[PDB]
Scaffold this motif. Structure first.
Motif, PDB file in Angstrom:
ATOM      1  N   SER B 353      -6.448  19.798  42.954  1.00  0.00           N
ATOM      2  CA  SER B 353      -6.515  18.490  42.669  1.00  0.00           C
ATOM      3  C   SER B 353      -7.231  17.672  43.971  1.00  0.00           C
ATOM      4  O   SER B 353      -6.446  17.697  44.712  1.00  0.00           O
ATOM      5  N   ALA B 354      -8.584  17.729  43.973  1.00  0.00           N
ATOM      6  CA  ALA B 354      -9.128  16.922  45.056  1.00  0.00           C
ATOM      7  C   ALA B 354     -10.510  16.375  44.727  1.00  0.00           C
ATOM      8  O   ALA B 354     -10.975  16.644  43.592  1.00  0.00           O
ATOM      9  N   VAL B 355     -10.967  15.554  45.749  1.00  0.00           N
ATOM     10  CA  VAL B 355     -12.070  14.836  45.075  1.00  0.00           C
ATOM     11  C   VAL B 355     -13.329  15.278  45.570  1.00  0.00           C
ATOM     12  O   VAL B 355     -14.607  14.844  45.305  1.00  0.00           O
ATOM     13  N   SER B 356     -13.365  16.262  46.381  1.00  0.00           N
ATOM     14  CA  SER B 356     -14.418  16.868  47.048  1.00  0.00           C
ATOM     15  C   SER B 356     -15.149  17.832  45.902  1.00  0.00           C
ATOM     16  O   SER B 356     -14.817  18.114  44.929  1.00  0.00           O
ATOM     17  N   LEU B 357     -16.436  18.465  46.468  1.00  0.00           N
ATOM     18  CA  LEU B 357     -17.146  19.407  45.567  1.00  0.00           C
ATOM     19  C   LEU B 357     -17.800  20.420  46.284  1.00  0.00           C
ATOM     20  O   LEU B 357     -18.146  20.121  47.447  1.00  0.00           O
ATOM     21  N   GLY B 358     -18.052  21.474  45.507  1.00  0.00           N
ATOM     22  CA  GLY B 358     -19.183  22.418  46.120  1.00  0.00           C
ATOM     23  C   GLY B 358     -18.342  23.159  47.258  1.00  0.00           C
ATOM     24  O   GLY B 358     -19.045  23.426  48.255  1.00  0.00           O
ATOM     25  N   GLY B 359     -17.005  23.652  47.236  1.00  0.00           N
ATOM     26  CA  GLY B 359     -16.446  24.646  47.896  1.00  0.00           C
ATOM     27  C   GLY B 359     -16.345  26.000  47.233  1.00  0.00           C
ATOM     28  O   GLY B 359     -16.771  26.163  46.251  1.00  0.00           O
ATOM     29  N   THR B 360     -15.780  26.812  48.186  1.00  0.00           N
ATOM     30  CA  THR B 360     -15.481  28.485  47.461  1.00  0.00           C
ATOM     31  C   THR B 360     -14.472  28.161  46.688  1.00  0.00           C
ATOM     32  O   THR B 360     -14.490  29.000  45.777  1.00  0.00           O
ATOM     33  N   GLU B 361     -13.466  27.345  46.771  1.00  0.00           N
ATOM     34  CA  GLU B 361     -12.393  27.337  45.697  1.00  0.00           C
ATOM     35  C   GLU B 361     -12.682  26.149  44.642  1.00  0.00           C
ATOM     36  O   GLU B 361     -13.502  25.204  45.196  1.00  0.00           O
ATOM     37  N   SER B 362     -12.234  26.321  43.293  1.00  0.00           N
ATOM     38  CA  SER B 362     -12.779  25.453  42.273  1.00  0.00           C
ATOM     39  C   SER B 362     -11.820  24.227  42.444  1.00  0.00           C
ATOM     40  O   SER B 362     -10.575  24.152  42.825  1.00  0.00           O
ATOM     41  N   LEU B 363     -12.661  23.065  42.364  1.00  0.00           N
ATOM     42  CA  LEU B 363     -11.912  21.753  42.231  1.00  0.00           C
ATOM     43  C   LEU B 363     -11.869  21.149  41.030  1.00  0.00           C
ATOM     44  O   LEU B 363     -12.756  21.007  40.326  1.00  0.00           O
ATOM     45  N   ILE B 364     -10.974  19.962  40.792  1.00  0.00           N
ATOM     46  CA  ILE B 364     -10.776  19.276  39.792  1.00  0.00           C
ATOM     47  C   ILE B 364     -10.271  17.859  40.123  1.00  0.00           C
ATOM     48  O   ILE B 364      -9.512  17.622  40.941  1.00  0.00           O
ATOM     49  N   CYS B 365     -10.966  16.714  39.261  1.00  0.00           N
ATOM     50  CA  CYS B 365     -10.500  15.654  39.599  1.00  0.00           C
ATOM     51  C   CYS B 365     -10.509  14.581  38.167  1.00  0.00           C
ATOM     52  O   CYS B 365     -11.369  14.888  37.578  1.00  0.00           O
ATOM     53  N   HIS B 366      -9.944  13.540  38.319  1.00  0.00           N
ATOM     54  CA  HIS B 366      -9.873  12.495  37.252  1.00  0.00           C
ATOM     55  C   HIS B 366     -10.506  11.144  37.796  1.00  0.00           C
ATOM     56  O   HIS B 366      -9.878  10.503  38.520  1.00  0.00           O
ATOM     57  N   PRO B 367     -11.893  11.201  37.723  1.00  0.00           N
ATOM     58  CA  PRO B 367     -12.489   9.925  38.520  1.00  0.00           C
ATOM     59  C   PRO B 367     -12.174   8.591  38.176  1.00  0.00           C
ATOM     60  O   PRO B 367     -11.902   7.764  38.931  1.00  0.00           O
ATOM     61  N   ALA B 368     -11.815   8.236  36.802  1.00  0.00           N
ATOM     62  CA  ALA B 368     -11.304   6.890  36.629  1.00  0.00           C
ATOM     63  C   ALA B 368     -10.068   6.409  37.484  1.00  0.00           C
ATOM     64  O   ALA B 368      -9.887   5.398  37.776  1.00  0.00           O
ATOM     65  N   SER B 369      -9.083   7.586  37.779  1.00  0.00           N
ATOM     66  CA  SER B 369      -7.927   7.094  38.513  1.00  0.00           C
ATOM     67  C   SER B 369      -7.886   7.373  40.081  1.00  0.00           C
ATOM     68  O   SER B 369      -7.116   7.348  40.823  1.00  0.00           O
ATOM     69  N   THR B 370      -9.092   8.014  40.449  1.00  0.00           N
ATOM     70  CA  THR B 370      -9.522   8.335  41.827  1.00  0.00           C
ATOM     71  C   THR B 370     -10.723   7.712  42.191  1.00  0.00           C
ATOM     72  O   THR B 370     -10.688   6.564  42.837  1.00  0.00           O
ATOM     73  N   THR B 371     -11.848   8.717  42.184  1.00  0.00           N
ATOM     74  CA  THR B 371     -13.010   8.246  42.921  1.00  0.00           C
ATOM     75  C   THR B 371     -13.442   6.913  42.357  1.00  0.00           C
ATOM     76  O   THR B 371     -14.307   6.216  43.187  1.00  0.00           O
ATOM     77  N   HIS B 372     -13.238   6.527  41.127  1.00  0.00           N
ATOM     78  CA  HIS B 372     -14.104   5.283  40.445  1.00  0.00           C
ATOM     79  C   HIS B 372     -12.751   4.316  40.068  1.00  0.00           C
ATOM     80  O   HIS B 372     -13.134   3.690  39.038  1.00  0.00           O
ATOM     81  N   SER B 373     -11.818   4.322  40.686  1.00  0.00           N
ATOM     82  CA  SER B 373     -10.611   3.531  40.383  1.00  0.00           C
ATOM     83  C   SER B 373     -10.586   2.185  41.012  1.00  0.00           C
ATOM     84  O   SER B 373     -10.252   1.172  40.045  1.00  0.00           O
ATOM     85  N   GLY B 374     -11.463   2.195  42.138  1.00  0.00           N
ATOM     86  CA  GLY B 374     -11.590   0.916  42.525  1.00  0.00           C
ATOM     87  C   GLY B 374     -12.861  -0.222  42.328  1.00  0.00           C
ATOM     88  O   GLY B 374     -12.857  -1.447  42.703  1.00  0.00           O
ATOM     89  N   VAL B 375     -13.730   0.400  41.285  1.00  0.00           N
ATOM     90  CA  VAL B 375     -14.806  -0.185  40.773  1.00  0.00           C
ATOM     91  C   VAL B 375     -14.316  -1.009  39.568  1.00  0.00           C
ATOM     92  O   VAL B 375     -13.217  -0.400  38.711  1.00  0.00           O
ATOM     93  N   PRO B 376     -14.917  -2.095  39.142  1.00  0.00           N
ATOM     94  CA  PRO B 376     -14.720  -2.861  37.964  1.00  0.00           C
ATOM     95  C   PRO B 376     -14.984  -1.967  36.864  1.00  0.00           C
ATOM     96  O   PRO B 376     -15.532  -0.784  36.826  1.00  0.00           O
ATOM     97  N   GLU B 377     -14.389  -2.305  35.589  1.00  0.00           N
ATOM     98  CA  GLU B 377     -14.454  -1.448  34.390  1.00  0.00           C
ATOM     99  C   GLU B 377     -16.200  -1.339  34.267  1.00  0.00           C
ATOM    100  O   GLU B 377     -16.590  -0.433  33.410  1.00  0.00           O
ATOM    101  N   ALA B 378     -16.820  -2.426  34.389  1.00  0.00           N
ATOM    102  CA  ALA B 378     -18.306  -2.201  34.089  1.00  0.00           C
ATOM    103  C   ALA B 378     -19.184  -1.197  34.848  1.00  0.00           C
ATOM    104  O   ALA B 378     -19.856  -0.591  34.422  1.00  0.00           O
TER     105      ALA B 378
END
Lengths: 412, 414, 413, 414
Positions: B353-378
């Motif tokens: 569970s992390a927000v990065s991408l393109g590593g040797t390890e596979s990564l996963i995240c839920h953008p609505a509660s992480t990367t995009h949680s600070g943006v308005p719903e629009a």
């Protein structure tokens, strides 16, 4: 919990394991990769802890005792080749030395396959011979009777402590029969009541294409400098195998100060994330380059690549103990040193060096380099001729390597 | 002689070039890999040389001592990988994007942008450079050349259109911007107005192996080398590739604002690039198989936003002409919302569970509660981010193990 | 417990704190030095953990997950060295200075500056931020509180005075800015205009060991850690120290513009700071001896712009009040202009001909043709950077060897 | 030209040489510091070059450097310069350097003479590993007594060839001394009687290379744990052997055969360290004198202080004055209350770290009977002056007033 080997019953693939096995990110602030402990000095919580620590290290009380970065490397290396345990050292030679120092004593005998890496042969024939250790050569590594004969010849002169083989051999890719070796050591043990410790230098094919522990070999030794590191940029050795034997090697490593350093350990972990990917790619390319050499339109050459060696006994051993051919092999030009030198000097993509298993392809002429200290007679009997050229295939595209070799044939 | 691009006439493959291009071992005592210059202080052979050096750097006299040795190798190889004339590497993706904005924008300037952009780029545009007097204009539909022209015209109404900044594929839906159509709309714009906005593509998701904007007339590409090119989730770095004169202006800004990449990370980058072709193709191979499995899994029908599974005709025509692979980052949408997504993610063993991408390890995240949680719903709607969407970035693990982990997640969260 | 500032009531000396402050070995397996986190990717224990983290980042929930572990130790120790509330480290001195300008300047804003400034700073102000609509106004005489007040007044004539940016001692003349007078002039400015410019001191030449601007009311100090703090001419890095709220705004800019220092350089910085007190005092001792020998050298009478050799009364009162040592970078002036300065520099064997300063090795350069060749000639001459001026930065070599090298240069020139 | 030892006739001071000796910036593009060659693989320009290389490497043709790693070579030139030796070889650790000396010269049946007490790791190599390989050891009873040194040599020669005379001075942890000049003359008299000369080796870690140069007193070789003072930052492991060229050459051959070379990255750290080794060792020595003087007169409890400057014996001071130019920063003091009191004291400190290393930037403290010297039998321990009340400190770079305040607090809480 951080040493999980399976998922819902099926075992994980090695390339999956090399990204997490033996490391719990949430014991290191959630860092997805292990931090580097660039120190060997770890303080005690109390003087009582310091005394307790040395009570355990010395055995005054029965069983913090490993560097954090070395432990992750060792866990992952033993996993890659199916071993119980592993110890990493500063170099391939210090790993081999630690084995010899852990087990040999004055009066001891060892059996060896032939040929061994030059540095190994130097340790046996120069240093340990002078310390009172005798060595006895297996006449034919594909003949179980010849392995048993070497064991009996060794037993005539003293206790047979080690049976040390290196398969495939450099540079002909000759093979030692590991299953036959195990059965001969079983019969030996039945006759004499003790069993020599078996060791395989597994650098050329391991740990991906050959796992001696699956064939009853007690220990494997690696020059991690080659394929496991794979980038021609760190020196390191590894010993894998049964826990009690590896424990004696670890004790010698600590006593002779042969630990791998933390920075190189960090590079090794990084390297091991692509070792499966890199070794299979290099082996695929080497397979294609070897087949092209075997039928090239320029000049008939002998190609000593495992897939091109037709002998029935060879292939029976190869099919049984190897799952790939690696990426180091040799071919033999017609003519002698002069033709080989002109050939090597015409190449643009192969770099002239004596190392192997890097990301870049390497090439050398063994008779004038790696094997130049051996008399010309002993070279000829070992198949190292003045026309023989050894290549170690890297990650370049096979079409570029073939085009490079094509240019060399023409300009020579 | 150290920049050989071909062999007997046929061009060398990129994976072959990454072991030698731009480096002569015999100017470094035969070392087969470049030594690391852990210093930025290089002495002059004479005071006259120092005065001559500053005469040239400043433009007082017309013309490599002007580049750090290790950065020069990374830049030569990076430009080779994506077909560009030149490259400059910075401390991070964000300082590379910053250098482009600082090199070309001035008060009153306008830019055209695609939507959605990386959050950090959007913050640069909407907070910092907006306060410095830069206006931004969004492309309504990146697959519509008419929508690209309209955004350019709207920008030109307000001032000089200095930049056309796009990011394709987009995060997290892998939406596409039509790069050829952007080129033709910029051709028509230049015909009408007599000047051409500089075009820039954030090429992090697919480049440099699976997409080369310079082959489509894009002036510059920008990269977070932190992701795929580095690929091992350690180093942080940025890259800008493109036309030499534009890269030179970006380089001048990099020096003035002190955002050079450090040598140790340059050595790590050089090492990484020796396997970048292999790693990216492997990750894309696994992601393709993982995406196909999700699309027909027996547990629950999900939408899978992977380029090979998006059937829209216009999308596929754009994908086929400007991409040679789909990358390894993609998203899928569970039925339900945050609660189901959280149970799914927490049940996994191989995805971190992390927000990065393109590593040797596979990564996963839920953008609505992480990367995009600070943006308005629009802004979530415009990026395709719903509460059921899960983004994965596939690493080098075996596809059979990733699929088994995902299969287990469906069972343990159903 | 690991941020202990004293022992038995009395504060610990800085060289003692550089071996432990801000690091608990028993939170890192007993390691006596901090391990290096060569990654910026930190995973969450659960999806809920991730949502909670961004709840904090966005301010939906009030509040170390928000700092890189190695950068945090560097920043704690740096703020400790110079007596500041807080610190943030960046990729370079220039990105630290840039972060300050980007954090606080807006179109139309004015700034006050001392002269001369580091060449790279002068380029940020006069080229890039001028093109973004920022005006700059120079303090004529940094020892004159009247001149500081005058520049602030001239700046306000054209717009809001957001920053008062000084660099003291100045590079390369060791000219001084009266920091106490600057604070008092800004107090009076605040009374006239109802707002207070933020004061910033580039503290590279003397800090953090020989000058602590925070003790004189300066809001922020900025450092090229590439110089003395690193000290080995083998890393590049910048630092901003000062008031917690101001450092926080610079940190937000640092992150938005991607100016983080990398972890490996942070580990080298931690290693370097274990000897920064020792190295800076040694270099300062040697520079005093070398400057004194230059001031009475047996070859040619030369002016020496070293703080202990500038006899002016106003200068020394300022120096004694705000500095506790003279650093190791200074200049001297030959009579033979550029031609003789070039012959001098070329004859040296121990001083390396390079533009950096504050390394273990001694360095020498000719500012008019290098470090300050980008400044217009009038501003260069008016600031005392003349064609005969040579700048040295003394390292850790033995003073007798450096003097012998300079002695040889006089002869061979 | 890059190995210049003087200026206008006077030799350069060591702190000056540590910034330039053995490195020419203009053979590295003007870099003021040596670049790091993070590789051991160096290619040949031609097949003929490779054959020529191995002609030399094997001794078939003499050397007319290609046979040394660039970074190890700079470290070795600077180390030999610091301690006045002809040559040096650096290894992965202090123990691998000591091991290489033993492996280069010992054979079954060989005898060696040793001082006591030795570092625990050395004592283990001699009494366990090399004892099992057939090597006998004989101890010098009183290192200040030339008669005691000669008696140990004679006792050793009764049982076989005396190959090595291995001493460690000052000794760890008591600062007991070996009279080096007296040892040389005893080896002269031994050589006259027996017709052969044992090779003399001095573990010079506690004082060297700055405060003691065994080569100035006829010692054949010095060995170092560069892990301690030379590195000085508790962050790298390395060994060094310095001395006569022919002997170092034999040690170097063993280093290669047993694979114990130092790695390039640690070498780069060593080069960096050596730029401050003079400064650091002199500072630690200053602080150590002040802390020792305070301990000798503290108002809490009379303790014996085994610091070279506080040992009043005439023979000791004559040896120290003759072969040492400083006292180092590691020393011991002895509490009355045995192990129990020693433990309470150590546990009460806040600035000294409880660890077994020495010569770091941080001051360290340990109880040798239960740690560093717990592997030697109690009988041999007690006779060497390592008692249950003995505490060893190694002073770093902290201010003396803080260390003294810390020790003061420990006395009170005990």
């Amino acid at each position: 919990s951080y040493h999980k080997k399976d998922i819902e019953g099926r075992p994980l693939h090695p390339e999956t394991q090399m990204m997490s096995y033996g490391f719990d990110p949430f014991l290191s602030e959630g860092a997805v990769k292990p931090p580097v402990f660039l120190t060997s000095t770890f303080a005690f919580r109390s003087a009582e802890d310091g005394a307790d620590f040395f009570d355990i290290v010395s055995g005054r009380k029965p069983l913090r005792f490993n560097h954090p970065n070395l432990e992750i490397v060792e866990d992952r290396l033993a996993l890659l080749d199916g071993s119980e345990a592993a110890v990493v050292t500063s170099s391939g030679m210090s790993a081999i030395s630690a084995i010899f120092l852990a087990f040999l004593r004055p009066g001891d005998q060892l059996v060896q396959s032939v040929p061994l890496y030059g540095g190994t042969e130097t340790l046996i024939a120069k240093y340990f011979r002078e310390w009172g250790v005798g060595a006895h050569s297996i006449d034919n590594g594909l003949s179980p009777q010849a392995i048993g004969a070497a064991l009996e010849a060794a037993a005539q002169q003293g206790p047979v402590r080690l049976c040390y083989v290196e398969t495939p051999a450099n540079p002909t890719n000759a093979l030692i029969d590991l299953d036959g070796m195990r059965r001969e050591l079983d019969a030996f043990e039945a006759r004499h009541g003790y069993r020599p410790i078996s060791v395989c230098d597994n650098t050329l094919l391991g740990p991906i294409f050959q796992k001696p522990s699956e064939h009853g070999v007690d220990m494997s030794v690696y020059s991690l400098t080659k394929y496991v590191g794979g980038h021609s940029d760190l020196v390191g050795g590894g010993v894998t195998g049964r826990r009690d034997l590896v424990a004696k090697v670890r004790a010698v490593r600590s006593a002779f100060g042969s630990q791998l350093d933390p920075h190189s350990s960090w590079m090794l972990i990084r390297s091991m994330e692509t070792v499966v990917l890199r070794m299979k790619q290099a082996a695929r390319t080497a397979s294609a380059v070897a087949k092209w050499l075997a039928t090239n339109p320029h000049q008939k050459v002998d190609v000593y690549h495992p897939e091109l060696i037709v002998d029935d006994a060879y292939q029976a051993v190869y099919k049984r103990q190897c799952t790939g051919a690696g990426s180091t092999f040799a071919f033999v030009l017609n003519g002698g040193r002069a033709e080989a030198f002109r050939f090597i000097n015409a190449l643009h993509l192969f770099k002239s060096a004596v190392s192997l298993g890097g990301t870049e392809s390497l090439i050398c002429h063994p008779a004038s380099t790696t094997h130049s200290g051996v008399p010309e007679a002993a070279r000829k009997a070992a198949g190292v001729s003045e026309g023989l050229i050894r290549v170690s295939i890297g990650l370049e595209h096979e079409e570029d390597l073939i085009a490079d070799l094509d240019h060399a044939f023409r300009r020579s």
